[PDB]
């Protein structure tokens, strides 16, 4: 009735075609179900659950489960971590050993660099057209989650994922307790680690900007699964069975989640609410999670905090479902269904129009406070040399009654300084007035409004993201995405 109407997709079963699998199947190593989506090749996706499905289409047709061809001894075929490298290759962590799979071909490759058993593969993928961040998407970390930093080995690769070399332990000599992951924080152009000394945990930064520096500590009950937002803005989501946290910064401040109900907000603790989140889907700006007691929650993740509302009820949870953001404002619940008469899996899909969904009078959400937000800086990526400045522009038309407050910010303030002017020019035929804001960007040192503890060198290149947003934007502003661009000094 409401939200989704189910629709079943199945092909290839027109006639008596004898198709059979060959080898040992692939299965996930966790109770939850996930959908990993490639950044710009968004048609290619991997559903990880009781069976693993690699689709080149957007989960159309009937997909055979991913299989190991037994030519190499993989032991137990349990997947712990998956990653998408640039090209036609996908990386899996099977039984502690790394493997590469080509999906255009049917090629399996064994990663020979790693010796000690790792559990997780991490990296960042930029796919702006060019040759700049193709090299950025080649630095990858291989590490074992839950280990002890004194004693354990961590590997890295700069030639994509061909050969893996262990890094020296001199840098990580003074960190004591258990590691929670090591990340190439390209928003900071830094290297960060998540560290669990006690029931609470924190973040450590290596490189000279804020070297030997700390972030605000946060509780670390059980393990955590860490999800980056794919626009290099540093937005971080840390979720597990009984907790969820959002880091608006790159790990400097990690905070809780708000919940909106009857025009009042409250902090959401999963354990105290006595719920269990089953699936998590993350867009560039949005976030959603399915709670296993047939519940769906949608939130807009931004600065000042994240507001999360509860969507109307629908019996969606069926022990195999997984949510994924098909598009902005378009969620999709996917459930694979087996079929032994043809030895194949078909799919059931719900296309959730959240924009149409959030108009129920029981919710009564105030409409959007901004009428138009448009700029031309989202198409490409911008580089700066020293003694060179650049300018970007944006146009915003606000609502008739409200008075929204825009704000522009830089991911990495240490090597990127801005000055933004917002001037009013003209007005629309209704009477609402256009506002034009232009930002001027250069290096942080040349401004001279920072300390020596904050400038953090000028001779080294770096990378950051510039974002224009509305500070007091309400919910239901799904389509009016804030503007973001990538700029390398």
């Amino acid at each position: 009735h409401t939200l989704c109407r189910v629709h079943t997709v199945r092909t290839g079963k027109v006639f008596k075609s004898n198709i059979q699998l060959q080898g040992d199947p692939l299965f996930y190593a966790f109770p939850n179900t996930f959908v990993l989506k490639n950044v710009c090749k968004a048609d290619i996706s991997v559903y990880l659950g009781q069976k693993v499905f690699l689709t080149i289409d957007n989960f159309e047709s009937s997909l055979l489960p991913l299989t190991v061809p037994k030519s190499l001894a993989v032991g137990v075929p349990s997947i712990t971590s998956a990653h998408f490298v640039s090209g036609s290759l996908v990386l899996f962590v099977i039984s502690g050993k790394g493997y590469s799979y080509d999906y255009y071909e049917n090629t399996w490759r064994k990663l020979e660099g790693i010796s000690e058993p790792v559990s997780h593969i991490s990296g960042d993928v930029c796919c702006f057209k060019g040759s700049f961040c193709l090299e950025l998407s080649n630095n990858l970390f291989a590490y074992l989650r839950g280990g002890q930093i004194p004693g354990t080995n961590i590997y890295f690769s700069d030639n994509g994922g061909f050969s893996f070399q262990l890094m020296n332990t001199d840098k990580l000599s003074h960190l004591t307790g258990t590691l929670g992951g090591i990340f190439h924080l390209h928003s900071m152009s830094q290297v960060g680690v998540l560290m669990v000394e006690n029931n609470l945990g924190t973040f450590h930064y290596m490189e000279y900007p804020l070297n030997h520096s700390m972030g605000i500590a946060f509780s670390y009950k059980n393990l955590l699964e860490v999800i980056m937002k794919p626009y290099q803005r540093g937005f971080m989501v840390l979720w597990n069975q009984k907790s969820i946290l959002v880091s608006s910064n790159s790990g400097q401040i990690v905070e809780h989640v708000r919940l909106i109900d009857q025009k009042i907000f409250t902090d959401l603790d999963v354990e105290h609410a006595n719920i269990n989140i089953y699936s998590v889907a993350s867009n560039a700006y949005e976030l959603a999670f399915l709670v296993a007691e047939d519940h769906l929650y949608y939130g807009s993740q931004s600065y000042m905090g994240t507001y999360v509302i509860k969507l109307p009820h629908q019996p969606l949870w069926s022990t195999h479902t997984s949510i994924y953001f098909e598009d902005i404002g378009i969620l999709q619940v996917l459930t694979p269904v087996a079929d032994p008469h043809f030895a194949a899996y078909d799919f059931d899909k719900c296309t959730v129009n959240v924009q149409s969904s959030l108009m129920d009078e029981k919710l009564a959400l105030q409409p959007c406070n901004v009428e138009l937000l448009e700029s031309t800086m989202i198409n490409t990526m911008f580089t700066i040399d020293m003694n060179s400045k650049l300018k970007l522009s944006a146009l915003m038309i606000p609502r008739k009654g409200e008075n929204p407050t825009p704000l522009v910010m830089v991911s990495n303030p240490h090597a990127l300084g801005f000055k933004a002017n917002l001037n009013e020019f003209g007005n629309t035929f209704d009477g609402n007035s256009k506002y034009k804001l232009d930002i001027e960007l250069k290096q942080q040192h040349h401004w001279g409004n920072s300390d020596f503890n904050f400038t953090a060198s000028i001779k080294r290149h770096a990378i950051s993201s510039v974002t224009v947003d509305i500070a007091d934007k309400t919910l239901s502003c799904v389509d009016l995405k804030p503007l973001s661009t990538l700029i390398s000094v």
């Binding site: 027109v14 924009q355 149409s356 959030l358 409409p367 959007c368 138009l372 629309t428 799904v478 389509d479």
Partner: protein, 723 residues
């Protein structure tokens, strides 16, 4: 049973100044029931006129002895009142045409102008025309496929604008428009029309014999695929052919001794071309022209007493067909085991037998596999054939599949159909107006549908959910199904009852009763694409044996919608696609603009669907706006190629690899009934049309007359040549 009529065919004119003629038929009648705003003349008469000035919806019902249903009719204030009338004449010596145009008001026009039989304007039309020249209104004609305009001269002594026009046969679609000068708060609507060479219907020699359908069978009708109002209709008593919308008709007969009397009453199917007519008499194909009645035989590549059907194209892709510069098949016949592709001049070779298809479909051989119906899809160079598969027989259930054949690649493909049907049911299928093949088929008791790339496959069902149409029409079998460019599909019953379907919509609509149970009727198209019902009855004075009346399908659908409670999800959807065929060379791209306007946050978008062998890249730029409680989304897309031919090997091979034709269609995300938008479907071809070349200035072929030459050149080559 009652109905109503209006003076004008075009429904844009329909407003408060119009009159509605209400006609009730029945033994019992009392009066008419109307709202207070509208008025009826002689309210105690079953035939009357209705005038109403206040806008809105009005509920009218004829009160009588029995139960008569009420009807809600919408009258809206409009500023478009007047209409164009045109009269053509053709000269062949100059190979051109001359048209005479004047302005007439449908409310106060002559009878002949209302039926398109006038040659001279009446008094009111002439005075209004000279008033429009005085206030300064001038028409002009604009060809659609290629953007050329033609202007008239001054007004003659009587109200008439005379325009000369080249004889094209490639851009047959034209519009006529005018300036923005209005008279007394009333405008004139633009008029769309088509014209090509005037075709001649055949004559009848004395001593000939009629060709009829078997007795008790329904009456058949077939028309030309490109230009309407030129058709042939077969009844139980006569075969008629019309150069018009059956205003004037001529009989079609056969020479003596060619066919038996029993054979002459066993005519199964008829197809009409410009060259001649084709009859399927008892499984044998006969070609009737103005000269002879020749029976096709093995010399032309057909089998005898084995043909079960034939078909032609259904969408006028005349521009691509003319620009292909290669004569292709114009007809496809099927004989349950073999298909044939009939070209021009009515001779052909066999296309495919069932053995090759059995080999193609990996069947285990010695199976009952049959071909039963072949249709030309919207893509010009492919065809589709319905395959019936027994699956080791011994039951009544047969699998129904589709197989497509591509003439450009000479290949075959099997699609996804999972239909199980009994032995008895016969099937007839049609393609809808879409780039993606969407199939509507019927088996004289049910209608099933295949939408959205053969994924939404099922049975069209009633709102009650019976899914059987004979039960709601007292046990009778499906007679006629008509599609159109818009996407509304009309199912006509032999009981003469009415069902309505919309493309990409599963639920059907049972229309109200408009025509008698016993009436011999057929549904056809006028000069425009509106619905007309033709009534045939013998035992008359030869002048009213065929009477045509229009059908207000849009108004009846609106009344049904006010009964039900549906609405269109989007306010508006605009696009800049003004053509159907787009051809560009290596160095140009194509830019398409579109926009949707809808309520506040019912999240929509524009679906772009493609078909063919993709050789292009898309770039899409989106703009979003909210204003006055409404959302506007604007899309700009660009199609282009990004290949290089410099310093490469196999240049011609890459040139052939990067050529072909593409089909694109634009549509909203979700749409329902009461959305009268036309879905834009077009085709884009890359390559040369073989009509563009290079001339040196000052040179021409035969502006300079000369004679034969001869010369010898020697000792200067790279010994003695005489050229």
């Amino acid at each position: 049973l009652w109905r109503y009529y209006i003076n004008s065919q075009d429904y844009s004119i329909f407003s408060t100044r119009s009159s509605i003629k209400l006609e009730y038929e029945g033994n019992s009648f009392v009066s008419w029931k109307i709202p207070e705003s509208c008025k009826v003349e002689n309210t105690t008469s079953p035939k009357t006129t209705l005038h109403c000035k206040r806008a809105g919806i009005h509920t009218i019902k004829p009160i009588a002895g029995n139960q008569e249903v009420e009807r809600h009719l919408t009258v809206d204030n409009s500023y478009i009142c007047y209409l164009w009338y045109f009269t053509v004449v053709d000269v062949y010596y100059n190979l051109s045409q001359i048209v005479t145009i004047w302005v007439y008001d449908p409310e106060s026009a002559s009878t002949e102008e209302l039926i398109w039989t006038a040659k001279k304007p009446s008094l009111s039309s002439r005075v209004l025309t000279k008033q429009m020249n005085t206030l300064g209104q001038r028409p002009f004609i604009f060809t659609v496929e290629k953007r050329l305009t033609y202007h008239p001269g001054p007004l003659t002594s009587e109200g008439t604008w005379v325009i000369h026009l080249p004889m094209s046969s490639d851009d047959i679609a034209k519009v006529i428009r005018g300036n923005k000068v209005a008279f007394q708060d009333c405008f004139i609507a633009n008029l769309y029309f088509m014209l090509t060479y005037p075709m001649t219907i055949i004559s009848e020699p004395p001593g000939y014999e009629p060709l009829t359908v078997p007795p008790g069978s329904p009456l058949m009708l077939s028309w030309d695929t490109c230009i309407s109002t030129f058709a042939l209709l077969a009844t139980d008593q006569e075969t008629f052919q019309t150069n018009d919308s059956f205003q004037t008709w001529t009989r079609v007969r056969a020479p003596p001794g060619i066919l038996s009397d029993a054979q002459r009453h066993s005519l199964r199917d008829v197809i009409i071309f410009d060259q001649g007519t084709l009859f399927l008499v008892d499984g044998t194909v006969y070609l009737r022209t103005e000269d002879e009645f020749t029976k096709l035989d093995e010399s032309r590549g057909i089998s005898e007493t084995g043909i079960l059907g034939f078909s032609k194209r259904r969408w006028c892709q005349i521009r691509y067909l003319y620009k292909l510069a290669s004569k292709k098949s114009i007809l496809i016949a099927w004989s349950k085991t073999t298909v044939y592709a009939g070209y021009a001049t009515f001779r052909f070779v066999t296309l495919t037998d069932t053995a090759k298809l059995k080999d193609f479909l990996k069947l285990p051989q010695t199976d009952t596999l049959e071909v039963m119906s072949v249709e030309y899809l919207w893509h010009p160079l492919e065809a589709a054939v319905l395959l019936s598969h027994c699956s080791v027989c011994t039951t009544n259930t047969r699998n129904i599949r589709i197989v497509i054949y591509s003439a450009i690649f000479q290949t075959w493909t099997l699609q996804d159909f999972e239909l199980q049907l009994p032995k008895e049911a016969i099937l007839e299928f049609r393609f809808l107006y879409s780039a993606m093949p969407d199939i509507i088929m019927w088996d004289q008791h049910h209608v099933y549908y295949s939408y959205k790339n053969f994924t939404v496959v099922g049975t069209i069902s009633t709102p009650s959910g019976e899914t059987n149409l004979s039960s709601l029409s007292q046990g009778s079998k499906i007679h006629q199904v008509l599609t159109d460019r818009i996407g509304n599909v009309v199912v006509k019953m032999e009981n003469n009852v009415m069902f309505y379907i919309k493309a990409d919509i599963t639920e059907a609509v049972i229309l109200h009763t408009w025509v008698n149970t016993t009436a011999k009727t057929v549904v056809l198209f006028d000069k425009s694409f509106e619905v007309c019902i033709l009534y045939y009855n013998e035992n008359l004075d030869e002048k009213y044996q065929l009477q045509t009346q229009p059908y207000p399908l849009i108004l009846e659908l609106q009344s049904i919608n006010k009964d039900l409670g549906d609405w269109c999800p989007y306010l508006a959807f605009q696009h800049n696609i003004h053509s159907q065929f787009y051809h560009m060379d290596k160095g140009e791209s194509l830019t398409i603009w579109s926009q949707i306007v809808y309520p506040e946050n019912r999240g929509l978008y524009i679906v772009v669907e493609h078909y063919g062998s993709s050789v292009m890249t898309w770039t899409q730029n989106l703009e979003y706006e909210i204003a006055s409680g409404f959302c506007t989304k604007t899309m700009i897309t660009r199609f282009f190629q990004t290949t290089n031919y410099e310093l490469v090997d196999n240049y011609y091979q890459l040139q052939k690899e990067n050529t072909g034709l593409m089909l694109l269609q634009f549509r909203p995300s979700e749409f329902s009934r009461t959305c009268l938008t036309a879905k834009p479907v077009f085709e884009i071809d890359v390559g040369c049309d073989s009509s563009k070349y290079i001339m040196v200035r000052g040179f021409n072929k035969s502006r300079c007359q000369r004679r034969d030459f001869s010369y010898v050149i020697d000792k200067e080559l790279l010994d003695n040549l005489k050229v």
